[PDB]
Symmetry: D2
Subunit: 296 residues, 4 copies
Amino acid sequence: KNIIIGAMTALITPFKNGKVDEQSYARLIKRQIENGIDAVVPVGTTGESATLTHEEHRTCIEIAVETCKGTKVKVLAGAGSNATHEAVGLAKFAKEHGADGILSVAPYYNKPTQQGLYEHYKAIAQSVDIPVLLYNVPGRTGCEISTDTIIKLFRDCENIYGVKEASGNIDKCVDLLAHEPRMMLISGEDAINYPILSNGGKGVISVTSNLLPDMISALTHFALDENYKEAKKINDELYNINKILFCESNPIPIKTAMYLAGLIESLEFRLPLCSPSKENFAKIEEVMKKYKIKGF
Amino acid sequence: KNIIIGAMTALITPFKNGKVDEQSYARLIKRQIENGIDAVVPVGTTGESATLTHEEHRTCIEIAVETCKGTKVKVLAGAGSNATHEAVGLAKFAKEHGADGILSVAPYYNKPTQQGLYEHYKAIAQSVDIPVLLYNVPGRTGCEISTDTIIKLFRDCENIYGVKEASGNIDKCVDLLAHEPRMMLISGEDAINYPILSNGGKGVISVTSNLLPDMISALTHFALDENYKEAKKINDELYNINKILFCESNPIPIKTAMYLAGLIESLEFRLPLCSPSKENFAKIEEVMKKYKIKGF
Amino acid sequence: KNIIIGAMTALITPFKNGKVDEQSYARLIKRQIENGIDAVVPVGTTGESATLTHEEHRTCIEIAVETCKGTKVKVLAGAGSNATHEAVGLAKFAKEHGADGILSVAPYYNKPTQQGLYEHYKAIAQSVDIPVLLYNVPGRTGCEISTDTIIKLFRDCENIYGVKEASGNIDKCVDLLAHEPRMMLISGEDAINYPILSNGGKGVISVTSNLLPDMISALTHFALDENYKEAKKINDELYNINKILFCESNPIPIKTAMYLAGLIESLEFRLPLCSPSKENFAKIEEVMKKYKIKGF
Amino acid sequence: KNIIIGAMTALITPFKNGKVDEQSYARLIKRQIENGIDAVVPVGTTGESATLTHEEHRTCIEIAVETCKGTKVKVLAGAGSNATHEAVGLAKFAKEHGADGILSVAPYYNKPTQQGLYEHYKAIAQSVDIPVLLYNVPGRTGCEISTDTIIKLFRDCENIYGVKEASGNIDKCVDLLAHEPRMMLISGEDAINYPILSNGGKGVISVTSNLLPDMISALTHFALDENYKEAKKINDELYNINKILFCESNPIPIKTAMYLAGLIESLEFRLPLCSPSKENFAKIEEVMKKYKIKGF
Ligand SMILES: [Mg+2]
Ligand SMILES: [Mg+2]
């Protein structure tokens, strides 16, 4: 199987006057490259995929593909939907724009069954010949991809190589890698990055890395080189910022943090997302001062 | 306030050869009309809104509007999205073909805050001047519209007149009606239709009514006439079918039941939704034979 | 079946200098009788059963039995345990001390299976010849008595006549009374007292009634007389006090309220229970402001 | 600080004709000793503490203390209660009988507040001068000891040295050891033994070790030697039996497994505990066939 692993960032999408700040989007991708990030994830959950146009969707994949060209950095483009046929289209259209692989979230809202999840992802995997990483986040989608379906999809479709897990369930990550140790388990939860890596996980798709890419990069590579002492210490050091980046719904805190560090120009979201409360604004701000933030 | 209340049906969308069976859609809406239904809800969750194209969206709202012209039955069109920009368009689009009001689901997947939910629905309500009913289903959206947000939207925007509750939280339904008794609480959960109505609820948007429109209509009208003994008696009789219609995700069981009753032509869904397992097929069929299913 | 229904109070156990204030216990029971209460529950969860000794247990049952002599009030004494041999013993000794019936909590901590719960309660029911009311409170016991187990126990032993439901699950209360309408469903959750009664429940075992016995008495009796309008109106009115009486774990807030109203002399608990935070203390005092508390 | 860490077993309590099989109890404890276990836990949750008398409570501590004399193995006796006055008494009662330390479960059923939990454990710690290990299992107790309360108790009372976590929350296990790395995190959940140990946990209190003590000992000692690959491989091999030992509530499956392996005499529990169904009997019987079960 062809895989995309290592330290990866779920890129935020900066807005300027209600439109995508394309120059800041690319400058932020270059900040990730120069800090040891192995892949960038355009238009993921942290990138506000839900409120971007299909043409803004296309614009930020191209920026990501172009900025990492000539580098070892891959583009795992967000290309998922709760309609399988739309998800198939977005997968084929992400490939046509140079993405090295796709992150495809479990169908949200309409709660498909395990049989439906299998056929949904099976249809996507047969749509393109580039790696496909599953994305399980039941707290946001309202459904769960069971361990059996993940393993079945991994074994039955050749380009499906792993799962991004955001479930706060270390038992499931033991279940997954004990029955199928060949899959690529990816942490989708910054606070528990190290435990997932220490059990055989092979990468991270991080929110914190938007603000602290060097620290997330060091964490993952220490772990992949089995230096768990150094990996655990950065994971322990990052716990406060890892939790405070979820005082409100992602990506509200991380975008607030990037604005407070001066890495984006305006703290703009697209509704129904909005700026945080003024206590969480202040309580994000008080935590950032104990972490050291690299510039451009 | 302008309102749409009473016994309402979240219409299934029958598919035949992968397209919307327009004749059966009309046929079914007239079947609802002739069994005491007060309003129909096209392209709700039970109508597989997520997998229909906008043009399909338009066809079933128009079919519903035309089938109920000249009758008492109202059309509460599904018009919601996890992007406000999109939800405003779908609301206007709905008004545009004669829908009497819109049911607008809480933004799914992207988990807006209470502040974002307020601005989301405030933007929708000021976009149209037809009634807007909120739709809270945290198990599917991953978010909850708090009682404070519901009540504020009810008081701050004149066309927002109530909420369709599908949260299995009778505590919230006393909380809602105790602090704002002028709002229209609508049950989106068939098993507890009577308890919600007995506490002052003014209607249901039902899945079961697709199969047993006469029984659900009678239940609601029994309750609205304060004949709670007869309203509770219909509710108790319906518990078995009300629960078995959720052995798998809605609308998989109800469409199976409609197909087994000979009310639609093929048991077709759009992925990621699919046919049920063979015992839930058997378990839907073995509970269906205990009820009297009205024909055309 | 012999039954104990109507408005019932889970009596708090007042402490003074680490001892049970037997005279203040008798004065709270008298105040319950004179405000329309149909039965009192000594040494329930609200009575701090876990921290009372066996004479205390016996002292408050005898005081309750003697204080309600010459009145219609009945005594449903708490006599349960997560060890079946102790639960049987406490049941037999509750009968020997003049209790009209027993409230038996679902075994806590050790999570018995449905088969174990059946045999547990079957041994209790065969140990005494007084009515037995089951008590399901999964948030505190860690286990749930399923509807089938409750219904099986109701049908197999004459003295098991119903269940005190404290699960915030109006669906389960439809499940129970739809399949076995001869059982006595009793509300163990003040905020949803009216919905449980409106669905055929025949009484409450209340926490708020300690502070506002007349209002809980009026609510319960209005419902049993099918004056649902009046019953919901007291329910809606008490919603604020019903919820804040659980800002901390029961009976911490209710004892704070009784102390703030001057109905007990000292705000004492037995560890691990203690008095609440001073913000919740201040916050309990602020909801009491709109209620009229009866004296002695 | 004095600590009790390493591979530890939550001993089952065998019954024959309704009473504790004292001769088999000693023969199971030495079987644990001869397979590399570092400490045994008499009358814990797996030992059916709730249904043992205080004379069997004293009988099973003395056998454990006496059977491990002249050996390395320590005795961490279960001595807890939801009444602080009983927990203090049982702690002094465990020390006087030769226990090397006490495991004290969070108060069950009566849901103490965080401040009440603090004073509860603070009172216990001053009663004895032997190590105290906190025991958090919210699914059984109905309460959670927060990270702040655990860290406060560890720092304020000299003999409180760590916690036995059974909450399936690896995030909490990062939270605990990142803010207080001197505490002893002990796994109370066999399936996630390795992830908890790899994050700095220093031992397990296991259910599976009753049946496979050598494998749990090797797992813990491989991990404590920072040979995490061999620890992860034993953890992965054990996942199936670790899960099947919870098909029903512990200790129903482990005692069934011990009975099927011929290590105990009778499949007897004390009510409300009971024998499992014939599924779970068959599913325990079929998962055991992949492991090698050491004899006497
Ligand atoms: Mg997220
Ligand atoms: Mg346990």
